[PDB]
Structure formats: C-alpha cells, structure tokens
C-alpha cells in the first residue's frame, strides 16, 4: 500500500503567512491576531559579519517596516523576544486559527510550510534530529517559514526558520524565540554534534517495510534489548527504553522487535546492494505513530 | 538534500466530502452542486465482478449520504461519467475555488491530498509512471482522494484514486472519468506492464546529487545522446529529445548531460554498494523543472 514522507494539511496555516521587509532584507512572518512574529535578523543592516543586535534595535525605525499579504499593515510596536522579532500591527488577522505553542524534541516529526516573500510555496514533513536541527531544503528567502503539527485537532506552531549551518543542516527557533540546539542567529561557523539516530524510528521504519512485503533483512536471529542498547551506545543510536511501543506492529507482522534489533546491527554495516522501500541505508525519519497511522489509519 | 514536496492544499481541503452507499465509505470532490467520486461506491459486492449499469438501475438516491463536517448534502441526481460517479446535490459549495480539469502525462509530478472517509489527512507529492500508475500510500477508505497541481496560479484537478494493483502500484482517473493507464475499476487480476524509466527525471535526480556533493558516480567517460537513446530502447528507459532542459544544471554543476548518461548505464546494473541521496537505485520522480526550483528557487 506504500510508505511516503507525508505532510499534514496546511489550510489553517497559509492565511497566517505574511511578507516582512526592512530596508533591503525581506522574509516571512507569522500573523496571529494583531501581531507578527519573524526572525529578528530582518533589521540587520549587514548580514555579512557578526551582528550587534543591541545596536540594530537602537537604530530601528518603525516606518522602515512593511508587513503585507497580497493588504498592507503598518507596524505600531517592535520588540525582541529571544531571537525572534515581535511586531504589533494595526489589523487583526480575521483568519486566526485556534492554536498553541510547543517545542519539538528529538525524533519527533512535524510539518514545514516553506514560504517565499510571504507566499506559501510548498509543504513537507521533517524530523527533529538529536542535535536540534532538521534536514530541510531551505534556500534564500525562506527565513520565517513556519513549522507546525496537529495533535487531536490542536494546532501547534513549533518552528520558524533562521539559518543553515556550514554542513548544510538547518537551525530554527520555536515561537517563544528560543533557538533549537542552542545555536546563535549569527553568520559564523557553528559546529553540529554527531547525529544520534532514533532507534524507535528505525524500528518503525523496518516494520513499515515488513508490512509492504519487504523481508530479506529479517532472519532466524533475535538480539536482546540489553545487548542492542550496549551496541547502540557505541554506534550513535538511541537506547530503547522498552519494546512496548511496538506490540500491535509486532502482532500484525508476527515479527518481534528483538528480531528487528538484530537486523539494525546487521543493516548498519550496509545493505549490500539491496533496498528497503528504495532506501539504501537506515532511515529514522518516521516515528512509530507516523507509521501505524499511515499503514492502518 | 532532494525532497519530494507538495503544493499547499488550502484550496482543495474544503471541497472534500464523505460519500457512503451501503457498506462502502470513501471520498468525493464537491465542486458547485456536483460531487464527483469513484463509481464503485454504488456497488453491493466489491469482492466479485461488478455489473455497473445493473447497479445504476437499482440506485436509490435516498441511500447516498454525502457529508462535510456537519452539512448533509442530499443527492438529487446520479449519473455515470467514465469510471466516476457524478452526484448533483441540493447545496452549492461556498468554498469552490477557481479551477480547471487537466490530464497528467508520464513523467509529470503532481500533488495528492490523501483523505480518509471524508477527512483530509495528509499531503504528499507523487509522479506519473509510464503505465499510468503512481507510487503513493493509499489504504481502506482513501478512494476518491484528489490529485492536484497549480501552474501560474491556475488550480487543476488531475487525479482521483480508485484502486491498488497487486504490485502496490496505485491507479486513478482524471476528473472526466478516463482511467489512467486504461485499467478497469473491477476487483479482478490486472497486471501492470513493463515500467519505463523517465530518463529526463533521472538526469535531474543525478544533477541534484551533484549539488548535494555526491559525485562518486561521475567518471571521466562520456556517452553520446544518440548512443544513450539506442541503449534506452532496450533497457526500458525513455529517449532523451534534448540536453537543453539541463543547461542551467550542467553549468552550475560542471558536468554535461552526456557524462551523466554514462552514469545512468553504469548505475542501472547496481550502485555497487553505495547510495545516492539515500536511494539504493535510480529514481525518476523528479522533473528538471522540479529540481531547478527546489535547488535554486525563483
Ligand atoms: C534566510 N532567508 C536565510 C536562509 C538560509 C539560506 C540558505 N539556507 C537557509 O536556510 N538565512 C540566512 O541568510 C542566515 C542569516 C545570516 C547568515 N545566514 C545563514 O543561513 C548563513 N549561514 C551562516 O553564516 C553559518 F554558517 F554561520 F551558519 C548562510 C551561509 C547564508 C547559509 C543570519 C543572520 C544567520
Ligand atoms: C478504495 N478506497 C480502495 C483503495 C485501496 C485500498 C488498499 N489500497 C488502495 O489503493 N480501493 C478499492 O476498494 C478497489 C475497488 C475494489 C477493490 N479495490 C482494490 O483496490 C483492490 N485491488 C484489486 O482488486 C486489484 F489488485 F485487482 F487491482 C484491493 C485488493 C482492495 C487493493 C475495486 C472496485 C477495484
């Protein structure tokens, strides 16, 4: 039946995206109520070198702002909230959805609505890596793009884009102005720690493969949870607290997690020219609930 | 990296409705006072071969139940149009978007709004394969989910899901009732023929891997376009009509198309153990226009 990296519908988020400009910098902002949130580096006079954000805030002028969506809104108030700029504007968004704010932990998945100059362009799914970054595809002009997730009909805003590390990783903020991974919103070479892959997600990915008729990687072998967790700590893998999150998947496929744990250790050395749903290497991008919901509704 | 993206779904979501007839529950597309949906909904047994006109003559319109959130759309007329069921309802959709109907061709990308029993659930991009199938993720209750694509602000409805073949390939139709690939909407053994790889989309895929710093598959050898087309006729790849579509990509990457055509023939037999953009084999779901926009915007 298939497995694809899916995005949640974005109909509630698109009417809240706006264009935000200051001088020669233009990016996107999130319009909720009578306030606009956007990365604070929109007011930097020179993103070339390291920015003194206190100087840029002292030299700010509200008239130099422009916040528009197809409709122009004047800015009446500007203030820093963490690495985020918070702008009050003279009009309340009539399409403000019921929403909350949250932060994303490692291994969790959420949806990226990538936008360009206030125009929502595309939407796709991502997965939070252990160092506080995501493998997005942000390019020039995508700062301010919003991340979100829906849980039990509750809309959460969880991500706003900011920068791209030298290794290509993408660093963003939550919507209280706190940058993921402790990175700075400065144009300087910042290093990313070694990536610890989520064993919970890798196991779910292998279960998705079994449900789609892939089976060459499971043998008459089964590795113990403590034995796997010892292997995990020396090969940059999360330790599995238990196998309880896979009871349903294990009964439907008739394959235990312990059998799947042995395959991970074997598959970590390479697939040997074979495929697992087109992947040539292990993939920790799908959570267990992501898989269970896509395979069984 | 190279990721499959989907155009946003704000215009499509409010047109999705839940259509149920007997024991069948699926989706429908509510446009004005017309609700299009797969015609198999009106069938009493989806396990055996279906007489569609005999079921149309026994169609009691009071048994339909069209629904969106809390609006109940009474069906006043029902008629076949190809493999699709076209219902006339007593209420016009106040959120009908400006749209047209389009037909996707092989090697072209579009978006899927995967809806489950009338509720829009997820959004993802797909690609049209030579035999009229796509490779997505559909399960029970997702029939009638809508394929769409926007070009220069023009919204096109292009796909409606119908069935899954035994090999996992997914089969749908356009909004005019013409089934892609010509497959029947019957629960019978139906083979998908030989799949033919779009060489346009593989060259685009290999270029995106060059921008991502993956260059182990490029050597110093080249291969003519004419000689690649001769090789493609017997290896189930489409022929290349021009190297012009990749003139931007070839300039930014420093590799002519002919050098990656040689890469195609080599990597077609297997990557030898290495990977490309996390793939284990050649991928052809990304058009040149797709790759260029994702890499360079504008
Ligand atoms: C805003 N639209 C961009 C988004 C970037 C463009 C490439 N991919 C993205 O996600 N963000 C920036 O331009 C920010 C901005 C200055 C520098 N910057 C960067 O992302 C740069 N990175 C760095 O300087 C580094 F290495 F330190 F992280 C860049 C080299 C352009 C990718 C500020 C204020 C951080
Ligand atoms: C409609 N909601 C489902 C969608 C299916 C469910 C699994 N993945 C999908 O794409 N499709 C159907 O109900 C259609 C419908 C009867 C049976 N059917 C199938 O898709 C079946 N396929 C075939 O019979 C086959 F292989 F021959 F094409 C099924 C075995 C359930 C996958 C009718 C009228 C074809």
DSSP string, B17-71: EEEEETTEEEEEEEETTEEEEEGGGG-S-SSS---HHHHHHT--GGG-EEEETTE
Written in H, E and C, the secondary structure of chain A is CCCCCCECCCCCCHHHEEEEEECCEEEEEEEECCEEEEEHHHHCCCCCCCCCHHHHHHCCCHHHEEEECCCEECEEEEEEECCEEEEEECCCCCCCCCEEECCCCCCCEEEEEEEECCEEEEEEEEECCCCCCECCCCCCCCCCCEEEEEECCEEEEEEEEEEECCCCCEEEECCCCCEHHHCCCCCCCCCCCCCCECHHHHHHHHHHHHHCCCCCCCCCCCCCHHHHHHHHCCCCECCCCCCHHHHHHHHHHCCCHHHHHHHHHHHHCCCCCCCECCECCCCCCCCHHHHHHHHHC
Residue B295 to residue B298: CA distance in whole angstroms: 10
| B168 Cβ under 8 Å from any chain A Cβ | yes
A139 to B9: CB separation less than 8 angstroms, yes or no: no
The answer to whether A97 contacts chain B (CB < 8 Å) is no
Q: Do A142 and B298 form a contact (C-beta atoms < 8 A)?
A: no
Residue with token string 């939070």: A128
Asked whether the CA dihedral A99, A151, B29, B24 is positive or negative, the reply is negative
Joined tokens for residue B221: 């050898």
CA–CA dist B188, A287 (Å, integer): 35
Dihedral angle at the C-alpha atoms of B46, B51, B52, B55, nearest 10 degrees?
-80
> How far, in Å, from the CA of A134 to the mean position of ligand 1?
14
Equal CATH topology for B13-89 and B99-182 = yes
Please name the residue of chain B whose CA is at the shortest distance from the CA of residue A212: B168
Q: B4 — contact with chain A (CB < 8 Å)?
A: yes
Phi, psi of B171 (to 5 degrees): -120, 135
3-state DSSP assignment of residue B224: coil
Residue A104 to chain B, least CA–CA distance (Å): 20
Q: With contacts defined as CB-CB under 8 Å, which chain A residues touch B295? A: 139
Measured in Å, how far apart are chain A's first and last C-alpha atoms?
12
Tell me which residue has its CA closest to atom 19 in ligand 2.
B163
Contact A280 B283 (CB under 8 A): no
Query: Are residues A279 and B274, on separate chains, in Cβ contact within 8 Å?
Result: no
How, if at all, do strands A154-164 and A99-101 pair? parallel
Method: X-ray
How wide is the angle at C-alpha B166 spanned by C-alphas B161 and B167, nearest 5°?
95
The phi, psi pair for B261, rounded to 5°, reads -60, -40
Place of tokens 């060459």: A216
Q: Which residues of B touch A9 (CB under 8 A)?
A: 9, 13, 113, 120-123
Helix-helix angle A288-296:A199-211, to 10 degrees: 20
- 3 state SS of B77: strand
Kindly identify which residue of chain A lies nearest to residue B5, measuring between CA atoms.
A124
Please state, in angstroms and rounded to a whole number, the distance separating the CA atoms of residues A81 and A37: 9
What CATH number should be reported for the domain whose range is A14-89?
Answer: 2.40.10.10
Fold of B13-89: Thrombin, subunit H (2.40.10)
Q: Specify whether A99 is catalytic.
A: no
| Residues B193, B6, A162, B295, CA torsion sign | positive
HSE, side-chain direction, 13 A CA sphere, residue B28 = 33
- Which of B10, B136, B295 lies at the smallest CB-CB distance from A10? B10
- Annotation says A141 is catalytic: yes
Q: By the CB < 8 Å criterion, does B151 face chain A?
A: no
Residues in chain B, overall count:
298
Most distant CA atoms of chain A, gap in Å: 70
Residue B204 has a CB neighbour count (10 Å cut-off) of: 26
- Interchain proximity A5–B7, CB inside 8 Å: no
Chain B interface, best mutation among A4, A116, A281, A283, by max B CB count within 10 A: A4
Cβ density class A192-229: b for 16+ within 10 Å, e for less: beeebbbbbbbbbbbbbbbbbebeebbeeebbeeeebb
Count of H-run helices and E-run strands, chain B: 6, 13
Minimum-distance CB partner of A6 among B8, B122, B271: B122
Rounded to the nearest angstrom, the gap between the alpha carbon of residue B195 and the centroid of all alpha carbons in its chain is 15
Task: Give the one of B7, B123, B136 whose C-beta lies nearest to A2's C-beta.
Answer: B136
Sign of CA dihedral B110, A204, A114, B298: negative
Q: Which chain B residues are Cβ-neighbours of A133 within 8 angstroms? A: none
> Going edge to edge, which strands form the sheet with A25-32?
A72-73, A65-68, A17-22, A25-32, A35-39, A84-89, A75-81
Check if the beta carbon of residue A38 is closer than 8 Å to that of residue A144: yes
Q: Return d(Cα B82, Cα A85) in angstroms, integer.
A: 54
Indicate the domain borders of chain B.
Answer: 13-89, 99-182, 199-296
Q: Tell me the three state secondary structure of residue B267.
A: helix
Q: Which residues of A1-13 are buried (b: 16+ CB within 10 A; e: fewer)?
A: bbbbbbbbbbbbb
Q: Is A119 a catalytic residue?
A: no
For residues B151 and B158, give the distance between their C-alpha atoms in angstroms, rounded to a whole number. 12
Q: Domain A99-182 carries which CATH code?
A: 2.40.10.10
User: Cα B206 vs. chain centroid, distance in angstroms?
Assistant: 22
Which DSSP symbol is given to B188? S
Chain A: closest CA distance from residue B13 (Å): 7
Residue-wise over B37-67: b if at least 16 C-beta within 10 A, else e? bbbbbbbeeeeeebeeeebeeeeeeeebebb
- The CATH code of the domain at B199-296 is 1.10.1840.10
Burial of B119 (0-12, 13-18, 19+ CB in 10 A): middle
């Amino acid at each position: 039946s298939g497995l694809r990296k899916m995005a949640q519908p974005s109909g509630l988020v698109e009417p809240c995206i706006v264009r935000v400009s200051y001088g020669n910098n233009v990016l996107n902002g999130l319009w909720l109520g009578d306030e606009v949130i956007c990365p604070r580096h929109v007011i930097a006079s020179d993103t070339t070198r390291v920015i003194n954000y206190e100087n840029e805030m002292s030299s700010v002028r509200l008239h130099n702002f422009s916040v528009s969506k197809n409709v122009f809104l004047g800015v009446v108030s500007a203030k820093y909230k963490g690495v985020n700029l918070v702008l009050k504007v003279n009009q309340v968004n009539p399409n403000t959805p019921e929403h909350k704010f949250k932060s994303i932990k490692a291994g969790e998945s959420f949806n990226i609505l990538a936008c360009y100059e206030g125009c929502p362009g595309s939407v796709y799914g991502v997965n939070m890596r252990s160092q506080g970054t995501i493998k997005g595809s942000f390019i020039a002009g995508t700062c301010g793009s919003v991340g979100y997730v829906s849980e039990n009909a509750t809309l959460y805003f969880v991500y706003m884009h900011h920068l791209e590390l030298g290794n290509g990783s993408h660093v963003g903020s939550n919507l209280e102005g706190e940058m993921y991974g402790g990175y700075e919103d400065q144009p300087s070479m910042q290093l990313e720690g070694t990536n610890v892959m989520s064993s919970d997600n890798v196991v779910a990915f292998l279960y998705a493969a079994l449900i789609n008729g892939e089976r060459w990687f499971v043998t008459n072998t089964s590795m113990s949870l403590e034995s796997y967790n010892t292997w995990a700590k020396t090969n940059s893998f999360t330790e599995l607290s238990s196998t309880d999150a896979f009871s349903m998947l294990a009964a439907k496929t008739g394959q235990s997690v312990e059998k799947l744990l042995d395959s991970i250790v074997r598959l970590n050395k390479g697939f040997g020219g074979r495929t697992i749903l087109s992947y040539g290497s292990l993939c920790d991008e799908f959570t267990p609930t992501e898989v269970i919901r896509q395979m069984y509704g």
